[PDB]
Amino acid sequence: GQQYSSAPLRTVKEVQFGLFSPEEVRAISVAKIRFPETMDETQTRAKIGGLNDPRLGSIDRNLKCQTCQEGMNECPGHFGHIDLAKPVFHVGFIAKIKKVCECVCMHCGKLLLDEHNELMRQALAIKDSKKRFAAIWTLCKTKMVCGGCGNTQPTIRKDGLKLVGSWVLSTEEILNIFKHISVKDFTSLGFNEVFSRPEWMILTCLPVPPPPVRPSIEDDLTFKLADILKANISLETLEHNGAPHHAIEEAESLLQFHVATYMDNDIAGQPQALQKSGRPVKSIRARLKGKEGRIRGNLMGKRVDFSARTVISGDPNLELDQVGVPKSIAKTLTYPEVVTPYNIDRLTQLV
Amino acid sequence: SFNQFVDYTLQDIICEDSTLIEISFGKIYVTKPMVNESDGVTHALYPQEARLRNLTYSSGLFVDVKKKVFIGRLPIMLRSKNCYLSEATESDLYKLKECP
Amino acid sequence: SLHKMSMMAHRVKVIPYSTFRLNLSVTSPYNADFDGDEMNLHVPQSEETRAELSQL
Amino acid sequence: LKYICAECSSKLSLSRTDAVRCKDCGHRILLKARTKRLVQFEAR
Amino acid sequence: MNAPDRFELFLLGEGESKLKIDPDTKAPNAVVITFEKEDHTLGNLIRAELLNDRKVLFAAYKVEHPFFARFKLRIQTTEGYDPKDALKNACNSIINKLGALKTNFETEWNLQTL
Amino acid sequence: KDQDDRDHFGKKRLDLAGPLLAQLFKTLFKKLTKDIFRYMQRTLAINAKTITSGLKYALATGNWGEQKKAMSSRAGVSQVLNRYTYSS
Amino acid sequence: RCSFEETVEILFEAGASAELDDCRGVSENVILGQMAPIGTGAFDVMID
Amino acid sequence: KKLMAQIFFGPTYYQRLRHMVDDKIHARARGPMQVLTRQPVEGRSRDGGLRFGEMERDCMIAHGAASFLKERLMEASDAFRVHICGICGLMTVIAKLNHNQFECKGCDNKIDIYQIHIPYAAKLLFQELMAMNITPRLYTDR
Amino acid sequence: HRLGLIPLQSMDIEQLEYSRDCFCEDHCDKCSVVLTLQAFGESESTTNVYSKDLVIVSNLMGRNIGHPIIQDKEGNGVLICKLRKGQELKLTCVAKKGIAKEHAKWGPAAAIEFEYDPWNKLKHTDY
Amino acid sequence: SLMSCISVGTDPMPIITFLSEWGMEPLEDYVPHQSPDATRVFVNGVWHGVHRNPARLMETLRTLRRKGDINPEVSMIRDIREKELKIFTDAGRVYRPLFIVEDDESLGHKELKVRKGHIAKLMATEYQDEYTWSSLLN
Amino acid sequence: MIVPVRCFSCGKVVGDKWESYLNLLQEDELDEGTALSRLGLKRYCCRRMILTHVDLIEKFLRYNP
Amino acid sequence: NQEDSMIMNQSSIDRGLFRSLFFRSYMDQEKKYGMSITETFEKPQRTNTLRMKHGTYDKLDDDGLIAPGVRVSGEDVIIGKTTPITAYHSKRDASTPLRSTENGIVDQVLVTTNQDGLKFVKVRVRTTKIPQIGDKF
DNA sequence: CACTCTCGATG
RNA sequence: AUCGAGAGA
Ligand SMILES: [Mg+2]
Ligand SMILES: [Mg+2]
Ligand SMILES: [Zn+2]
Ligand SMILES: [Zn+2]
Ligand SMILES: [Zn+2]
Ligand SMILES: [Zn+2]
Ligand SMILES: [Zn+2]
Ligand SMILES: [Zn+2]
């Protein structure tokens, strides 16, 4: 097998889905990702203190791997983290976020209708999160004026990877909005306390997947992360140094684009973000989408050991519940039989 | 189809579409399938040698340019006009190690 | 494998030549002729699982 | 060792650091000669 | 690739005896003999010759699988008559008939032309 | 008069080696004359590898239309000649 | 539900709504590589 | 002996097709795995395994054979042991074995740790979801 | 293969021995018969290689054996091969005692015609 | 299929010139009310005008093709009841050879143009190896 | 390739009868049936064996290697 | 011979019924790099080459190729090539093994320079396949 | 939306 | 290994 662990062997009973809070993201990480360089640094077969750190996981068939050692077969994957110069949108939530902005007015951070209303008392009565959110969203997106703060709530529509307003909404602004929706309003529309918050949907800092996720024979994920870090350093460079008005915004949209296409590459947006070889690139989303995906192709079913396959033929002299097995296959396929006093002679002869 | 492409279409592609500002492209010349070796010596290429040496059975294109020049290599369909095998007899094909 | 009878536990009989040989009357549940059809064979790796095969 | 040309009845013996082409021919297609160690055949 | 050697049709394997005489548990005074490296050529002939013996109640041969060159021969005789003696008498009868057949064919061949 | 038959073979065409190589060569030659325009405005040194490696690529991969995966001709226009049997 | 048709989006809205997976479903124990509550595994074996 | 029924018997042109058993016959008992999923490689020439697909899984479910299903999906394929934090329930655990030092930066956990057996493809899925800003928290209690 | 199928004289075959039974290494004169074949394209025309071109090398020591059967009218026998102009065939054949049950090349007989009860008076056949 | 071929493509211009020089009224000089029964002539999907007395034109065209003056791969469709004449010089058209049936036989009826003499010449060419398929077409 | 040495079905030698067959076809100008008959090929398996054969080696010999 | 299967006469099979020749070509080539780094065809020793193959190289000659006529089977090495990347083990193995499932006889070895002046090789192995139980007709 | 062998060009 | 192509049931 592997090796003795002092930890008790337990079975997975529950799976609690949720979001990755930036705080927990940077707290979980074991390596900061500053340099976009992959491995080699000035003609050196090693790892620069940027991408693919030895802390994330050594990759040279060594005996060491981030203090804990245990080679590279026992070691799972140690995540990193990268801080973005400016917050961006998570593609798979573009719809959901766009709905949350229509359930709560701007600046303030309160629900439009309360228990004072008649229909809202019936909408918030639903215990099911999805049905509750679906019911409230339809009876709240028609409100224009507004707890006080009577601000005229604008009409928000989708455009590429940003959001507009009609009386353009920045990602930082929406962060500041979702940061002030408080706890009581979260339970009213599906979200959880310490598991999933709207202020965690947007990507402040994003986690960096370990080398076992993106192996080297480099992987597409390595290139995409290199692109994200490239746009990040570019944005920082355009921010700290000379900062034009109509230039840094393009860098923000670029970083947003790369981060968005890093996860989902099949969006309504025509730019599919190709690669150097002209390949449309393999996103994380495409990896999971069946039937060649991870779930249907590696979890619901997968290639197995101790298996054989051959052209079949009929045999009038075999019993119904028998199967003719070629000698070569019989030599190949094996069974682990523990040595007992009952079979020690037979097994000894077989050996 | 291929013969139609070589004897007519190619000239139309070169002449009736391209002119710069000047250099006007004139006639197009299609040679017999040959190979420019690493040795430097350019020589005639027969299909069997092409298949054995993983080469490409292609001829060269040469255009007259005003105010001649090699512009690339066109893969030649076997038993076409520019193919050596079209004019070849049975004994020729046998000697060329090509199946009749 | 359309139904459960597409996977059934058989008793091994090692034979010469390179073909999975099966009884004719087992053709119907597998839906298989012998005009080039190929079949797969999976070997259990413990007592409890081969017990599952032999008893279920 | 030794080789033999393709489109002529020759018998080259040029080892490594030589290869192509051929002696009094000009073509670069070279085949390897048959082994000296005889192989038996069960005439069945 | 998985095909057995051809001589395994007539060449006795390691430890394999020609005849394997086993007591039949079904009917009393019966026997089943396993002939190795033999086929229908010997089986059908011996079986047919055992049906001529009027003191033989049962006689049947079978080749359980055409892959292997072997056949089983079940013989049941009357009480006071060992089945091995029936097999022996059958064999000797066969040999005698074949000797006579050979002699006759030879004397008939000498009287021919071209 | 009833609807037109969209499955009528007479109102369909079969593009052979000619037309395909014609489209491809028009593309490659336009790219070539464009490149030559660039070398001209930069100022005999004509990159012949464009047409050569282009034609070779499209004939080797079966992906008609140089190296752009946006092509809908990914159905393998050129295939390895099946030589299992003369009839094949 | 992610092991059929819409895969990734299901996981997305699952992570967005913080859904609890009881793991008493077949495919869920199939993913976890555990003896699912199926026929043979529909109970427990203890000693007395 | 004669045959009762007479036989339709005569010359007929038959042809030998390209499919021959010795080019098809395949058997693997623990062979080369892939690098990404750590599952058996694809192909007879690469000494690969055969896909115990979705429908086969369905069949084994219908049979009720649970242990066989688990064995096909673990021991006979990609069986991997991972460590899970008792707090957040993620694969953040830094297990320094041979020193029994199960660290976890983020929750300060050294004594409340767990160990589970899942497919390596499941670990891959969970890691990819974590790389997609999703937390598949794994608790071992009801 | 073609060489294997060639009919050889098996008159005194009963005083030859099986190689498997012979106490020698591989083969000898008591168990096998060695005969060579050396053919070379000489003429401009096609040079045929027949079974008559087989030449016994081993010592037959009296036994009528090994000689390739030639029922051919021109005295050539089985057409083994065809050579061009510079083509050559040099080989050695070891012939061993064998049973047609092992391989059909050791079959002494062709077709054996066999028919009983021409009038179907026994009714072994329902026409 | 064994005998099916593909049109290589040819220049439609000389056919156009012929049509115009053989009684085809230009489309720009077409007045529908004063000539309703005028067969409109098409070439490669292009309406080049109409034409009265289309039978003579069609027989002329067909004769030209069968002589060789018009490329044998060029298709010529005469639609009587629809009063249209569509000539295609388009490439990629799948066509096939057919025996021509004519009723020019005086001491007879409608017979194949090809006769046993032609076949005899063909097999003469076959046995000798000058009268080939092209001569059948011309 | 070349004329099969013996008939597949029964085992009658037929590899010595090919040239004789060709001669019987061109020299005596016989038809295939009578030619096959005179060569003692009564059973239609051998009859087939020679009649059905295509001597491809005669083309194989057209190459110089 | 039920459910679309057939019985074939073994005796006729012995006489050459439906026998076939099966040729297979392997192609290898010596790579080239900017700084004149070149792979070479040779028979490498286990002490001077990394990784190596589990099969034997004893059928290779000095030029790293089999002589046509030699019987090959299993995972034998057909083409011997190395790639360099003092110091022990200065070469990486890039040799080509005979197909693991197949076997036969080296029919013909072809050695030829490429258009870019690269010495590349095509080795053809011949195998006579005899009709067996499970063959498709 | 619905298991194989394979080939052959690509990074 | 990643994308296209042929084919087996
Ligand atoms: Mg059927
Ligand atoms: Mg079938
Ligand atoms: Zn580690
Ligand atoms: Zn407000
Ligand atoms: Zn030469
Ligand atoms: Zn934790
Ligand atoms: Zn001896
Ligand atoms: Zn016969």
PDB file of N, CA and C in Angstrom, chain L residues 47-76:
ATOM      1  N   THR L  47      25.906   0.180 -19.060  1.00  0.00           N
ATOM      2  CA  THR L  47      26.708   0.986 -18.146  1.00  0.00           C
ATOM      3  C   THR L  47      26.931   2.406 -18.660  1.00  0.00           C
ATOM      4  N   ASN L  48      26.523   2.664 -19.896  1.00  0.00           N
ATOM      5  CA  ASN L  48      26.785   3.954 -20.523  1.00  0.00           C
ATOM      6  C   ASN L  48      25.506   4.658 -20.969  1.00  0.00           C
ATOM      7  N   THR L  49      24.365   4.015 -20.748  1.00  0.00           N
ATOM      8  CA  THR L  49      23.089   4.561 -21.199  1.00  0.00           C
ATOM      9  C   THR L  49      22.015   4.476 -20.114  1.00  0.00           C
ATOM     10  N   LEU L  50      21.237   5.546 -19.978  1.00  0.00           N
ATOM     11  CA  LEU L  50      20.192   5.627 -18.963  1.00  0.00           C
ATOM     12  C   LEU L  50      18.906   4.918 -19.382  1.00  0.00           C
ATOM     13  N   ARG L  51      18.043   4.670 -18.399  1.00  0.00           N
ATOM     14  CA  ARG L  51      16.738   4.042 -18.607  1.00  0.00           C
ATOM     15  C   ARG L  51      16.822   2.653 -19.240  1.00  0.00           C
ATOM     16  N   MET L  52      17.191   2.601 -20.519  1.00  0.00           N
ATOM     17  CA  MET L  52      17.296   1.347 -21.269  1.00  0.00           C
ATOM     18  C   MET L  52      15.955   0.621 -21.382  1.00  0.00           C
ATOM     19  N   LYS L  53      15.949  -0.492 -22.109  1.00  0.00           N
ATOM     20  CA  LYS L  53      14.746  -1.302 -22.249  1.00  0.00           C
ATOM     21  C   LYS L  53      14.915  -2.636 -21.533  1.00  0.00           C
ATOM     22  N   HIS L  54      13.799  -3.227 -21.119  1.00  0.00           N
ATOM     23  CA  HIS L  54      13.828  -4.505 -20.418  1.00  0.00           C
ATOM     24  C   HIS L  54      14.160  -5.648 -21.373  1.00  0.00           C
ATOM     25  N   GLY L  55      13.896  -5.436 -22.658  1.00  0.00           N
ATOM     26  CA  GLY L  55      14.218  -6.419 -23.678  1.00  0.00           C
ATOM     27  C   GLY L  55      15.707  -6.458 -23.965  1.00  0.00           C
ATOM     28  N   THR L  56      16.141  -7.457 -24.727  1.00  0.00           N
ATOM     29  CA  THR L  56      17.561  -7.621 -25.026  1.00  0.00           C
ATOM     30  C   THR L  56      17.971  -6.868 -26.287  1.00  0.00           C
ATOM     31  N   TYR L  57      19.250  -6.518 -26.360  1.00  0.00           N
ATOM     32  CA  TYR L  57      19.798  -5.793 -27.500  1.00  0.00           C
ATOM     33  C   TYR L  57      20.753  -6.676 -28.297  1.00  0.00           C
ATOM     34  N   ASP L  58      20.859  -7.940 -27.898  1.00  0.00           N
ATOM     35  CA  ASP L  58      21.869  -8.847 -28.443  1.00  0.00           C
ATOM     36  C   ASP L  58      21.687  -9.145 -29.931  1.00  0.00           C
ATOM     37  N   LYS L  59      20.542  -8.758 -30.485  1.00  0.00           N
ATOM     38  CA  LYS L  59      20.268  -8.982 -31.901  1.00  0.00           C
ATOM     39  C   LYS L  59      20.666  -7.772 -32.744  1.00  0.00           C
ATOM     40  N   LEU L  60      21.096  -6.705 -32.077  1.00  0.00           N
ATOM     41  CA  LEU L  60      21.552  -5.503 -32.764  1.00  0.00           C
ATOM     42  C   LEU L  60      22.998  -5.641 -33.222  1.00  0.00           C
ATOM     43  N   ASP L  61      23.341  -4.947 -34.303  1.00  0.00           N
ATOM     44  CA  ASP L  61      24.716  -4.913 -34.784  1.00  0.00           C
ATOM     45  C   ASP L  61      25.412  -3.644 -34.305  1.00  0.00           C
ATOM     46  N   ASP L  62      26.547  -3.326 -34.918  1.00  0.00           N
ATOM     47  CA  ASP L  62      27.314  -2.145 -34.538  1.00  0.00           C
ATOM     48  C   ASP L  62      26.598  -0.859 -34.941  1.00  0.00           C
ATOM     49  N   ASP L  63      25.755  -0.952 -35.964  1.00  0.00           N
ATOM     50  CA  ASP L  63      25.034   0.209 -36.478  1.00  0.00           C
ATOM     51  C   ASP L  63      23.691   0.398 -35.776  1.00  0.00           C
ATOM     52  N   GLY L  64      23.450  -0.405 -34.745  1.00  0.00           N
ATOM     53  CA  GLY L  64      22.227  -0.307 -33.969  1.00  0.00           C
ATOM     54  C   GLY L  64      20.996  -0.779 -34.716  1.00  0.00           C
ATOM     55  N   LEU L  65      21.186  -1.720 -35.636  1.00  0.00           N
ATOM     56  CA  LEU L  65      20.079  -2.267 -36.409  1.00  0.00           C
ATOM     57  C   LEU L  65      20.171  -3.784 -36.519  1.00  0.00           C
ATOM     58  N   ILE L  66      19.020  -4.436 -36.652  1.00  0.00           N
ATOM     59  CA  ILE L  66      18.983  -5.879 -36.851  1.00  0.00           C
ATOM     60  C   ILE L  66      19.345  -6.209 -38.291  1.00  0.00           C
ATOM     61  N   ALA L  67      20.013  -7.338 -38.494  1.00  0.00           N
ATOM     62  CA  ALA L  67      20.236  -7.846 -39.837  1.00  0.00           C
ATOM     63  C   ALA L  67      19.019  -8.658 -40.267  1.00  0.00           C
ATOM     64  N   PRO L  68      18.432  -8.311 -41.423  1.00  0.00           N
ATOM     65  CA  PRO L  68      17.255  -9.016 -41.944  1.00  0.00           C
ATOM     66  C   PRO L  68      17.484 -10.520 -42.052  1.00  0.00           C
ATOM     67  N   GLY L  69      16.601 -11.295 -41.432  1.00  0.00           N
ATOM     68  CA  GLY L  69      16.746 -12.737 -41.382  1.00  0.00           C
ATOM     69  C   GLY L  69      16.643 -13.232 -39.955  1.00  0.00           C
ATOM     70  N   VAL L  70      17.088 -12.404 -39.017  1.00  0.00           N
ATOM     71  CA  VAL L  70      17.042 -12.742 -37.599  1.00  0.00           C
ATOM     72  C   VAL L  70      15.609 -12.784 -37.077  1.00  0.00           C
ATOM     73  N   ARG L  71      15.268 -13.857 -36.370  1.00  0.00           N
ATOM     74  CA  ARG L  71      13.952 -13.975 -35.754  1.00  0.00           C
ATOM     75  C   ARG L  71      13.847 -13.049 -34.549  1.00  0.00           C
ATOM     76  N   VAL L  72      12.736 -12.328 -34.458  1.00  0.00           N
ATOM     77  CA  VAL L  72      12.486 -11.441 -33.330  1.00  0.00           C
ATOM     78  C   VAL L  72      11.119 -11.719 -32.713  1.00  0.00           C
ATOM     79  N   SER L  73      11.031 -11.573 -31.395  1.00  0.00           N
ATOM     80  CA  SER L  73       9.785 -11.821 -30.679  1.00  0.00           C
ATOM     81  C   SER L  73       9.755 -11.054 -29.365  1.00  0.00           C
ATOM     82  N   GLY L  74       8.574 -10.964 -28.764  1.00  0.00           N
ATOM     83  CA  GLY L  74       8.414 -10.277 -27.496  1.00  0.00           C
ATOM     84  C   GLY L  74       8.810  -8.816 -27.564  1.00  0.00           C
ATOM     85  N   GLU L  75       9.551  -8.362 -26.559  1.00  0.00           N
ATOM     86  CA  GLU L  75       9.966  -6.967 -26.486  1.00  0.00           C
ATOM     87  C   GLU L  75      11.429  -6.793 -26.887  1.00  0.00           C
ATOM     88  N   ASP L  76      11.843  -7.497 -27.937  1.00  0.00           N
ATOM     89  CA  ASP L  76      13.197  -7.361 -28.462  1.00  0.00           C
ATOM     90  C   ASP L  76      13.417  -5.965 -29.025  1.00  0.00           C
TER      91      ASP L  76
END
